[PDB]
Design a protein around this ligand. Structure first.
Ligand code: MG
Ligand code: MG
Ligand code: MG
Ligand code: MG
Ligand code: MG
Ligand code: MG
Ligand code: MG
Ligand code: MG
Ligand code: MG
Ligand code: MG
Ligand code: MG
Ligand code: MG
Ligand code: MG
Ligand code: MG
Ligand code: MG
Ligand code: MG
Ligand code: MG
Ligand code: MG
Ligand code: MG
Ligand code: MG
Ligand code: MG
Ligand code: MG
Ligand code: MG
Ligand code: MG
Ligand code: MG
Ligand code: MG
Ligand code: MG
Ligand code: MG
Ligand code: MG
Ligand code: MG
Ligand code: MG
Ligand code: MG
Ligand code: MG
Lengths: 117, 144, 64, 201
RNA sequence: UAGCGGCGAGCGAACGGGGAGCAGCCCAGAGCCUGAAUCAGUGUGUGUGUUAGUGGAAGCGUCUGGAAAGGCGCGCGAUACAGGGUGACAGCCCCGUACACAAAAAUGCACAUGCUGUGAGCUCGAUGAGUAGGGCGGGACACGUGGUAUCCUGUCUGAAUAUGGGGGGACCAUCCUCCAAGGCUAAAUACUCCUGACUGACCGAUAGUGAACCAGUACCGUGAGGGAAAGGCGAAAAGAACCCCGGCGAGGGGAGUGAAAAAGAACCUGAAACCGUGUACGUACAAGCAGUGGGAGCACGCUUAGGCGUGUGACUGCGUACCUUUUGUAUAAUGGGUCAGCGACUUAUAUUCUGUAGCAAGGUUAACCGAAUAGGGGAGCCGAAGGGAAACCGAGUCUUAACU
């Protein structure tokens, strides 16, 4: 029962090199190198599904801050104000409104100010 | 029931280990041998009883006894054996014929093991105190 | 082929009814005058092989 | 229990422990796997590094050349080298406990009955060693893929059956586990039953 | 196992039991009867094997296709459906196969018979001496000089004679058993350079022989010796007439053959590394494992819009490869130029445990027989009894005079 490995091995290498498309040089041509590239790609990707949630929140905050300061209050007090007003709109939505409905954002600032006054 | 609808009892054909076939298997690389040293090597390992150099237990301790050539031609008979002989007479020959003692046995003892529920005539055999009580209770006879 | 008995083990251990091994005590061969009578008395009777050593003895006596 | 004769419209009295017991599949499996293994010839070999042709000369000095150290031109690492765990003729047969053998047969016969694959008749023979006659008889009986088991060897029947691929003929003494399974129907003469019964105590 | 054993590592019987096979003779001598059984060499006969061979059943229509053995229809042979070949997969086209047959000649083996030679049965004898034994040194016996019987003998010695002698594991007695120092003998047993037939959960061109091929070659070496690489057009060569560029080239473009030249001789399939031509997108103010997360723009498809697929990726957050070895490696420690193929926990027998199955105080047979994976074979082995060094006692036993 002698077993030849070509068909199985070829499918295995091809499955990796296909995931390496777009990579530079040996990384998209040469199995040994492609394999290490695909692994590192998964590692980073795992890492960055966690990081992605960090970077976006960091973006929202920064924009809320800008829009808050435009209406004369700082991010930190604005958040405290809204918390004391039992407003529960989160930061993704608040950052959207900061950009697309400047009049509603101002109204949110007045609700924050009132709750702090 | 066809040659392609028969299968073995659950758990009766466990699969063999195959070392050295990668990370997923759990037995890759070192193959469960750990790292380095004598035991990791092909053909590596120490002999039975070896303890590292210390005088081992089977040399530490002293020899005792001798072997009795007589014990080996001496057999014990159970009460449960007495009915298994054709003729209700138990001798060395009878017991040999019924395959109860070895062909070269020259002495035998009936002991209190199992039971006897039929009258038997034991003869040319030693009989234990208990066995004599049991053999006689069932109507049997002992004689030299 | 058949496993071979470590024959020197077979001259020092005997299997008992429940599967352990009996053996003779060390220290009662010579240099006896200095040894207390009490001490020597307690070395006369046979003793049982300890838990730590059964693996070793059993390995040496596959046909015990 | 009683087996209805196909066309005698008569009954035959058989041992319930033989023809009437539960299917022990694990038991049957072990015996048919053992039978198939017992049919293996086991004849082959390959060459170890010791048996490959060539000499024991070290292909190059141990140190200094920059090549991986080598020792034998027949190393199994090497093209043209020995096979690391080269094969030898082996005997693949297995022991089957006598009682496990008979038990397996009993279970088989009992499923055949239970699956209506067992057919009993008074006689089964042909008038001449002509394949055409057997074929004809089989058509008339609505049989095609079938094991015929008779009491004593029947020569005509044996010869007439040989070129029929879906048909095998067998005297009661020579039955086997995989034949009892491998055909759609099994036809047995009364005598064959009486003999198999005696055989399975 | 009993034993041997720096009683270490190891070495390892025999008695007895089950089987295969079975076969018993001659000389050490003269007489009487005498060619009387036997063997061999060998003529002849028949028998029968081998070395060439002979016969050997039964299918046609239709569809697809370059081709039919394939599909579909309806037939037929089969003691032959083992296998192979034929333009794709054939019981019925071919070769075979089942079965039935055959030798002028040489040869094997067998009974029969002639022959040269060998001697049969009978009576009365005879009965293996530098031998057995022994001292010394070694060797062989499972047995290593041990308390060491038995065997062989290099050296020195040296008996008895059936009223005798050997052995029974130091040695002695008793008893039992056998008869050395002369020889022959078939079967059961071991093997395969070779011949024929058949088979394989053996390989299928880096495998299987070193060798599928003009291989023990080419090649290396003074020599012994070492020792490769290297299979596939197509069904059929129908292997490309003829024309054109070119050196009466290499190479190519047509034509033609073919089902196909997406088979053209470097010829089935035709992967990967590696190298090109073409298009889309990016790229010449920009610093690092080259990706990943966010993301404009362009190109290309959508959906008929919907802020979606695909490719690209300005800009931006994070981010020092893998293996190995280590307390610890981006490590300036190891290993890998890349790809493809190969490359490492097996196998046999013992042993124990787990899982599973059978039978259960029983379970199971081995060699072998065989009606051959059945059935026979229970010789054995493990288990239902232990304790004691042992004798021995025994559900107990040992310890001790005896155990609270
Ligand atoms: Mg690519
Ligand atoms: Mg990382
Ligand atoms: Mg295994
Ligand atoms: Mg290592
Ligand atoms: Mg270490
Ligand atoms: Mg270790
Ligand atoms: Mg027995
Ligand atoms: Mg002492
Ligand atoms: Mg090879
Ligand atoms: Mg059997
Ligand atoms: Mg041996
Ligand atoms: Mg014998
Ligand atoms: Mg015989
Ligand atoms: Mg023909
Ligand atoms: Mg074709
Ligand atoms: Mg003599
Ligand atoms: Mg002698
Ligand atoms: Mg001594
Ligand atoms: Mg003689
Ligand atoms: Mg041959
Ligand atoms: Mg080759
Ligand atoms: Mg190939
Ligand atoms: Mg040309
Ligand atoms: Mg054409
Ligand atoms: Mg062309
Ligand atoms: Mg090609
Ligand atoms: Mg620029
Ligand atoms: Mg740079
Ligand atoms: Mg260090
Ligand atoms: Mg680090
Ligand atoms: Mg490095
Ligand atoms: Mg390097
Ligand atoms: Mg590779």
């Amino acid at each position: 029962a002698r077993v030849k490995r070509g068909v199985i091995a070829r499918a295995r290498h091809k499955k990796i090199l296909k995931q390496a498309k777009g990579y530079y040089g040996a990384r998209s041509r040469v199995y040994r190198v492609a394999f290490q590239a695909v692994i590192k790609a998964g590692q980073y990707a795992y890492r960055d599904r966690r990081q992605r949630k960090r970077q976006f929140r960091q973006l929202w905050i920064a924009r809320i801050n800008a829009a808050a300061r435009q209406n004369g209050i700082s991010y930190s007090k604005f958040i405290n104000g809204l918390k004391k007003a039992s407003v529960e709109i989160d930061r993704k939505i608040l950052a959207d409104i900061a950009v697309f409905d400047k009049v509603a954002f101002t109204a949110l600032v007045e609700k924050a100010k009132a709750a702090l006054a | 029931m066809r040659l392609n609808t028969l299968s073995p009892a659950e758990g009766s054909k466990k699969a063999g280990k195959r070392l050295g076939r990668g990370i997923g298997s759990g037995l890759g690389k070192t193959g469960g041998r750990g790292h380095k040293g004598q035991k990791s090597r092909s053909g590596g390992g120490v002999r039975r009883g070896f303890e590292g150099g210390q005088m081992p237990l089977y040399r530490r301790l002293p020899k005792f006894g001798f072997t009795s050539r007589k014990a080996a031609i001496t057999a014990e008979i159970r009460l449960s054996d007495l009915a298994k002989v054709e003729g209700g007479v138990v001798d060395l020959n009878t017991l040999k014929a019924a395959n109860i003692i070895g062909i070269q046995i020259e002495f035998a003892k009936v002991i209190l093991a199992g039971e006897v529920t039929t009258p038997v005539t034991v003869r040319g055999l030693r009989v234990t105190k208990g066995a004599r009580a049991a053999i006689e209770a069932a109507g049997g006879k002992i004689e030299e | 082929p058949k496993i071979k008995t470590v024959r020197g083990a077979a001259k020092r251990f005997k299997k008992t009814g429940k599967g352990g091994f009996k053996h003779k005590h060390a220290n009662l061969r010579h240099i006896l005058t200095k040894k207390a009578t009490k001490r020597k008395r307690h070395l006369r009777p046979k003793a049982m092989v300890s838990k730590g050593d059964l693996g070793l003895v059993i390995a040496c006596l596959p046909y015990a | 229990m009683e087996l209805v004769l196909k066309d005698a419209q008569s009954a035959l009295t058989v041992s319930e422990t033989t023809f009437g017991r539960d299917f022990n599949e694990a038991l049957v499996h072990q015996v048919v796997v053992a039978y198939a293994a017992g049919a293996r010839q086991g004849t082959r070999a390959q060459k170890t590094r010791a048996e490959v042709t060539g000499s024991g000369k070290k292909p190059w000095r141990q140190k200094g050349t920059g090549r991986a150290r080598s020792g034998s031109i027949k190393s199994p690492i090497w093209r043209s080298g020995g096979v690391t765990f080269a094969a030898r003729p082996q005997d693949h047969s297995q022991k089957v406990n006598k009682k496990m053998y008979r038990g397996a047969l009993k279970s088989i016969l009992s499923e055949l009955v239970r699956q209506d694959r067992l057919i009993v008749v008074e006689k089964f023979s042909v008038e001449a060693p002509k394949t055409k006659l057997l074929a004809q008889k089989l058509k008339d009986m609505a049989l095609e893929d079938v094991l015929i088991i008779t009491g004593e060897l029947d020569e005509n029947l044996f010869l007439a059956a040989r070129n029929l691929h879906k048909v095998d003929v067998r005297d009661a003494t020579g039955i086997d586990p995989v034949s009892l399974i491998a055909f759609d129907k099994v036809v047995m003469t009364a005598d064959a039953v009486k003999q198999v019964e005696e055989m399975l105590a």
